């Protein structure tokens, strides 16, 4: 699903704060449209990310018109942004539906690299992460998203924005990581209890992580937590403390 509409990516940029002379990443630029709106801004590195050949061409093209621009063939679930030997990357990017939340999840594991990111995901997703505890959409991303960034929804964009149009509605979320961020250990953790105690919605804490932690009793009552708490009962806060006894 290539992004058209002209204004729309202008309207993405302009709400990414991004500056002049900035370092921007772009996943999946695809047929370039997002990619020109960010490098109307005249950042200092524009790096984009592609494997799709059938869009390389048009990629080269503009490359020739904007030195600034920087085109790497490679799997974006392959790329540490530590690979990318630069500092204060402001991301701005449309995911590809396939790997979003994967991706989203990678980039905030190596936040101290980031300034910012400026995302267009399905909407679906941006609600997941944007999610408050005891609300509808509140899981797993809500919990590693929380601890690591400041959220905030956007806009919503239309099927219409596309080519061909996707089924489903997009949005767009920027990320700002937290000015305090808990250690890389912990989150890495906090990701991995989080899948087990999410898998289900009705789970009891002390029955899903029960493998994991066959003394789970004994660390909710460290933790003063109810016994028998269910998954979306806990806080991002809650599953860091858990994290720091496991």
């Known amino acids: 699903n290539f992004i058209f509409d002209g204004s729309l990516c202008d309207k993405i940029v302009r709400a990414s704060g991004l500056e002049e002379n900035s370092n921007v990443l772009e996943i999946g630029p695809g047929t370039g449209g997002l990619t020109r709106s960010i490098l ?3 950042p200092k ?12 061409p048009l990629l080269n093209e503009i490359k020739q018109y ?7 063939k490679q799997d974006a679930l392959k790329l540490k942004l530590s690979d990318l030997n630069t500092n204060k990357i402001t991301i701005i990017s449309n995911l590809p539906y396939h790997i979003g939340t994967e991706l989203v999840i990678r980039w905030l594991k190596e936040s101290s690299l980031v300034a ?3 995302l267009m995901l399905q909407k679906e997703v941006v609600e997941r992460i944007c999610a408050k505890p005891s609300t509808k959409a509140y899981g797993r991303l809500s919990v590693i998203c929380s601890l690591i ?3 905030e929804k956007c806009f919503d964009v239309a099927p219409t924005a596309f080519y061909p149009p996707p089924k489903v ?3 767009i979320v920027k990320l700002t990581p937290l000015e305090n961020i808990p250690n890389s250990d912990l989150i890495s953790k906090v990701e991995l209890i989080t899948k087990m105690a999410f898998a ?6 002390k029955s899903s992580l029960k493998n994991l932690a066959p003394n789970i009793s004994e660390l909710l009552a460290k933790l003063n937590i109810s016994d028998n708490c269910r998954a979306e009962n806990l806080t991002p806060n809650d599953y860091l403390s858990l994290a720091s006894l496991i």
């Open 40 to 42: 109307h801004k005249n």
């Open 116 to 118: 910012s990111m400026t």
């Open 149 to 151: 960034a400041t959220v």
């Open 45 to 56: 590195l524009l790096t984009v990310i592609e494997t799709d050949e059938r869009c390389i």
């Open 66 to 72: 904007h030195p600034n621009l920087n085109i790497i």
């Open 200 to 205: 289900g919605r009705r789970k009891m804490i």
């Open 169 to 171: 509605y997009s949005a």
